[PDB]
Amino acid sequence: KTPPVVFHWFPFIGSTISYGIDPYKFFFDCRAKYGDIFTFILLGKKTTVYLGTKGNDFILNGKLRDVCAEEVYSPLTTPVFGRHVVYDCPNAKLMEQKKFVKYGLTSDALRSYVPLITDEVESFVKNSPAFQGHKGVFDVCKTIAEITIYTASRSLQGKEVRSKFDSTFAELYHNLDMGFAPINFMLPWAPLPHNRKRDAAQRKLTETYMEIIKARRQAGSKKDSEDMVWNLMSCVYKNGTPVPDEEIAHMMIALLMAGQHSSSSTASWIVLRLATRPDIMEELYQEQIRVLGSDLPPLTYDNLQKLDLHAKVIKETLRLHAPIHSIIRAVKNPMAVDGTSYVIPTSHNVLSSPGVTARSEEHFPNPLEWNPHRWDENIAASAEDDEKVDYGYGLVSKGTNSPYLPFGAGRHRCIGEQFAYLQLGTITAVLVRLFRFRNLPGVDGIPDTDYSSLFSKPLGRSFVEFEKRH
Numbered sequence: 001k002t003p004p005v006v007f008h009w010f011p012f013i014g015s016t017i018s019y020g021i022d023p024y025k026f027f028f029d030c031r032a033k034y035g036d037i038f039t040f041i042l043l044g045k046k047t048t049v050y051l052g053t054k055g056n057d058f059i060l061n062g063k064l065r066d067v068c069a070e071e072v073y074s075p076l077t078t079p080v081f082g083r084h085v086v087y088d089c090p091n092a093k094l095m096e097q098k099k100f101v102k103y104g105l106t107s108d109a110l111r112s113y114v115p116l117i118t119d120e121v122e123s124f125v126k127n128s129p130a131f132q133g134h135k136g137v138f139d140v141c142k143t144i145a146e147i148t149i150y151t152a153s154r155s156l157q158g159k160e161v162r163s164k165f166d167s168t169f170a171e172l173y174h175n176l177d178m179g180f181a182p183i184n185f186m187l188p189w190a191p192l193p194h195n196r197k198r199d200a201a202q203r204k205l206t207e208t209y210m211e212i213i214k215a216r217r218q219a220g221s222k223k224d225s226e227d228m229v230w231n232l233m234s235c236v237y238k239n240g241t242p243v244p245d246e247e248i249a250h251m252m253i254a255l256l257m258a259g260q261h262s263s264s265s266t267a268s269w270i271v272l273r274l275a276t277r278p279d280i281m282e283e284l285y286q287e288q289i290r291v292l293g294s295d296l297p298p299l300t301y302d303n304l305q306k307l308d309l310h311a312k313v314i315k316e317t318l319r320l321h322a323p324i325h326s327i328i329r330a331v332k333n334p335m336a337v338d339g340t341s342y343v344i345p346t347s348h349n350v351l352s353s354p355g356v357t358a359r360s361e362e363h364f365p366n367p368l369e370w371n372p373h374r375w376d377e378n379i380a381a382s383a384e385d386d387e388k389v390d391y392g393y394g395l396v397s398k399g400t401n402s403p404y405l406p407f408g409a410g411r412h413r414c415i416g417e418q419f420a421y422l423q424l425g426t427i428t429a430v431l432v433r434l435f436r437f438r439n440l441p442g443v444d445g446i447p448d449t450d451y452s453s454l455f456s457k458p459l460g461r462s463f464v465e466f467e468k469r470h
């Protein structure tokens, strides 16, 4: 049987439609019939799925030779981010690029970001049409996407980029973002207009970033703390070569896209969940009074860390809504399941879904319930029991006895996690100070999840009520 093949009704299209609408149900159904191993092919390819912590570990801590990350994602991502970065290079190069970024994301940089982020959010609320007036409704995703783009560009991308978003960067991003179109799952190369727009934006962004850098050199200065003034200096690879401006530009673009899509989606889910749960939001608010005090002094890198429930709300949301549902590798050499008869072959993709474990009864009783309090068992912005293996950058716990891996594990694990927590936690705390949220009358629960795009996000246009506090 090799790995059980998934009984479907058509060639090529296979089960993909089933996948596309909802993978998790799809995976679960598959699980029920076939257990922890499946095979369905989506589009062209045979994607082999290993569920379970072991399923997770196998693929995520899979051997460098045996599974390849870039061959799967490079075409799609590479046109977008640019050449030579992320997946446009051998793994070793990737590891050094992660190193530079993680280098640029130390606590003292993180500290520097918090005031900037609180400033952008507070400025947005004051100056934006979104929250004008005491009581109102607003478009969550649109509103939240703007906030995350402002907060990340000010802190991480820096002043010039932030300034640009006022002019010309908004459209560029939107155009570039078309590179993540579902047809681009198959046809990234083809010169459809949207692809031609994508290529046009990518070039233009690169020219801009490069001019920003060159201008900095021209004055040969520094001032705080963006990954930019950081990649200028964290120039050098082991070979002794400093990172070229173009690479810096393409790295920034990658970080921009990555952070924005992940942040905006997650942040959206947080606002949506909170709207459903006025009790939690008040508790969050009550936490700030209790822990920071009645005065509600300004949020800092230090005092944020006390927001245990805020931390929990993010964790709980990540558990159910994290935008990445499927992690995929290209099988380079046939691989032996430690357990079983099945052998996984080269014509195959391997797909792991930590979200599944994430929403399993064994691992999480009543998993589908969005309850932050379930975490009263533990909290880690940084986690847990397993071994730490250093690949390049730092010392990453590939640890995989954890059912909960929103940020992945092994050599491909997120280096943006701390930043993401900082950003989300900060945005959440501010909003909680400023607002109450309710559902529109007669509206219960939350919209559905749209898995059609590479990242997943709330489906429709969802409005929710906002009430201000003073």
Ligand code: HEM
Pocket: 069, 094, 098, 255, 258, 259, 260, 262, 263, 266, 322, 323, 324, 327, 328, 406, 407, 408, 409, 411, 412, 413, 414, 415, 416, 417, 419, 420
């Ligand atoms: C909630 C937000 C985020 C989530 C859920 C998230 C999730 C993940 C996941 C699951 C992976 C591993 C995927 C794989 O092995 O292919 C990953 C890797 C990564 N993430 Fe994130 N991420 C988030 C935010 C960010 C941010 C803000 C950045 C940049 C600032 C970032 C940059 C990266 C990078 C560079 C990798 C490396 C992937 C690789 O080496 O192949 N992420 N992220």
Ligand SMILES: C[C@@H](c1ncncc1F)[C@](O)(Cn1cncn1)c1ccc(F)cc1F
Pocket: 073, 077, 086, 254, 255, 258, 259, 262, 323, 324, 325, 326, 327, 328, 414, 416, 454, 455
């Ligand atoms: C490849 C992509 C992905 N992988 C698997 N399933 C869905 C997906 F969107 C992703 O892992 C998403 N991601 C990672 N951190 C934030 N977002 C990724 C990683 C690094 C990056 F530089 C850009 C980027 F999109």
